[model samples]
Target: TGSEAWWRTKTGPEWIREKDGNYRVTFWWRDPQGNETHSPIRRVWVYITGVTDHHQNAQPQTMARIAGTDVWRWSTALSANWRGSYCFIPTERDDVFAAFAPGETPDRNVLREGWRQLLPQAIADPLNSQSWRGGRGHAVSALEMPDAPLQPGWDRPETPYSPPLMMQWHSERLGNSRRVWILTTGDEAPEERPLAILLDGQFWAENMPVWPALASLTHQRLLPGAVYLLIDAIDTQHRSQELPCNADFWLAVQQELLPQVRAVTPFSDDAGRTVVAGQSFGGLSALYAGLNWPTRFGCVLSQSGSFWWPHRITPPEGEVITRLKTGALCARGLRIVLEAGVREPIVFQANQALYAQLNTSQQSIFWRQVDGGHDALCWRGGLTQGLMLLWQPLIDT
Candidate 1:
């Protein structure tokens, strides 16, 4: 009888406006089994990207069950501009909170590791209709505050077009194989179009499908018609090995992968028009490609790059920063767009340091500090914005 009466009418989280100008967002879940006392599920963990602190000493937030009912609820305050994805994990075990002992302060690293272990069990809000499959193949619920920046074409109905051409790339140098999806926008001759190489292709192609947004941007003339190459990361282990400052992986892309892509659709050979883009480790890789192989990847669009590579936490100087300082890498002739979330301290500081390093160089660079955290919900907007900025010259011409 508590929130059940009203919950029946609602489809998603309840947002109540507070007098202090912040929203009191309440996430609700009803156990499908039975009443709270009869249910085997011990706890419900609410994981909200950027909002939930997974990196620090803070424990994961758990929903409180209403007495005599299966209703579970958790409430928090959020700014009007905050936007991220969230999911709930109803676990039968209570050991998830064992790290928070009564007297001992838990190690932040332990807490972080524990949080990641819970992600595989996450599930989307049953009542929320707006959901997307996350990179890990989990259904995630979206939360967009009223004032959150608009993601123009994400919600638009997909316009009909030929399906993306799928190619299996077996890398001889790297000793791995993965699927790559190639989608071209507009009817322009392939050689005249710019190229965009997007890392973590499987997520964009299968989970969130950026093709609709890319097509919409091209159709609207906001961005020039281009060839989009979505490259898969394969899996977690392979991604960790290949995406961060991995020259060998980039070399394979240049030598083996590109030729396969060329066979299907020949894109511009001019490096000035080619952009390599990604987020997190992929973000760091994109910049690495631009800095080291400017002749091939003339532009970089990095969102929340893991510039803190080789360090568990962000240090005074990351590997990329050190290389830049020692003149080991050059940024000349490369156009770059870098974005990081203000909420992700490690990534934000790392990106800021990289931007500072680029400032002393002749590189054309743009930086944006987003309001959200290391989330695809935030990165999606940055990705589109970065592409628009990097390809502005092409659009103008």
Candidate 2:
């Protein structure tokens, strides 16, 4: 029978509790037969994010290897209140193979070409199914301490199915045509509901899956019924050009895309009922749109916004922070919901500064600094909660 029979009965990554309420997290990569994987992967490291004197750094105690036989041991410990996400970076000992880094390369097909090719890039814990979009190309595995609030419900069984409409449209401002996905709760007339334009639509609609949270929130009446517009950004290059605090791009959404979509679809057109939401740079763009075209989009939701915008490349401070400090765009009746992760200090600091500046009209904005970092794994929660605060009129009270 081969390694197949051996893998049928192996178990690992067991968690145990010590008397002090600390946790012992043990990890191992092996088949049921106790045989380590056969590949050029020279070393295994646990890259975890969260907890002090911790997060994103490798701990020597958790390293694993071939322990005389086929079995390898890997693990570490955390406090009872510790929580974070993790993934394994399986690297070849020498930098030779890393030159052709697997995840580093743009194409996924070539990565699947061979084991030698695939082993260079770090990957999520194959043993842990719980994961989310770490960012653009990578996936991070999730781990939470028992004391941490359980992650919010991602999938709601009792919700009704709402199929998304896929359509292709051209944008004169951006000089390109792209596909868009739209969704709505069936109970209300589409045109009668509030509307939210979600940037980086493809990723959120699929990998990040914000629909489930929408369904759950609406069912619980935490968020009002609304229609969603998810506009796709084909790749990194296209995203960089469109999602930045670009005036033309927002003009396209305000003058072209909105009119074109509303002409065919039954989505609402009321400014007070409209919201623009996005992640990272898209997040920056959302705030930009609200500041520049307040009459078109009255509400804005941003998660880990690259407030450092024009200065992101290499600057001491973020442009948005600078603008807010100078009072360039602050106004009444403008509602904003901002989210940031404590682990990302620059982003967190930018958001904090933005919050302080906005505190002049504290009632007009909501801010949340949560656990985790600048990844979709963290953004998913922010997206839902931020939407609730924006869409649910009662929340402000």
Candidate 3:
């Protein structure tokens, strides 16, 4: 009762600060006690002050087993509220719970179900998880961020490329050469443009709605871009041998594979812009490239990148992970993209921690996460959001 009651009466800066600054939303509350009205036991009154816009269902359900505290495992407690409207989900408090009963049950139900579903990206579970795993088992077919032609007002460059450990075994047996795709933008098509070589290029091409979306975006002046190439990996995890863990593989990709890409696009064709995109383990190296070869790539785009791989991997960065409390391998950069999914504990907590490190240190980085799990579904949804976050002036004239 001590912790629960105290929680009902107070909130710390982490929660309060969310209401300040750009959010500017106000709320009123306190360590409350039930009020005894004039002659009404049935109709008691409560007061609210300075409160502003908030989602109707911010509170939790009384029926919910895990309302707050350990609400749900693998849920996003970190960076969950960044300048947004929210309400404290204190435990059953006498003063407040008694006054706000069944009337607020719906909020509780939704919050309960919301947590139940959103624990580890409820949406993705339905799309990817097997039915037996307490998931809906629905195949993902929605093209959320298609690279289609855009109309006015719709956010420009609504999708960024989704890269991963790509490998197409069929292509390998047929042709000794591997194919890659790099996406960038520009009208002048400067002497050299940023080149992005992805691991699972085909998966992103087919699964992520980026290309169709890009078609409309470029036509509408939303962003200046082009997606170059180098496609590897088909399914499973073939990229382990060729990325992040080994610089020799990437050195080959950079020195050998990239030149092939330039042969067609030409350094002069783009504008001399180059970077790498990868997911999970691959994400680790894409980041390493920027840190290790700052002059070569200048930066990287990591989606659900793996920073805490059991064995330290390098390429781009000498040793991965910049530990704060404990000494660890650290990487640096000027321009980079980082994202995480809310569903995975490691993805959310680790990514959030990493983002905070890069941001606070003043490294050039963009960071965010999606309301989903780790994999195509989350990354698919994240493409548009990531593009929006990273869509800067390109050159910053």
Please name the candidate that would achieve the greatest TM-score relative to the true structure: 1
lDDT of 1 by residue, 69-180 (tens): 7788899988888888899989887775574555565676776777677778899998998888877668898888788887766656366265788988999999988999
Q: Residue-wise lDDT of candidate 2 within 241-273, one digit each (tens)? A: 888877888888778877777775676666666
lDDT of 1: 0.84
Better of 1 and 3 by TM-score: 1
lDDT tens per residue, model 3, 295-336: 666547788777756432221222355542244433444567
Clashing pairs in 2: 6-32, 6-33, 7-32, 7-33, 10-32
Instruction: Assess each prediction's global lDDT (C-alpha) against the native.
Output: 0.84, 0.68, 0.44
Give residue 370's lDDT in candidate 3 (0 to 100).
53
Indicate the residue-level lDDT of 110 in model 3.
40
Worst ten-residue run, lDDT, model 1? 50-59
Which portions of model 1 show Cα errors greater than 4 Å? 2-5, 99-106
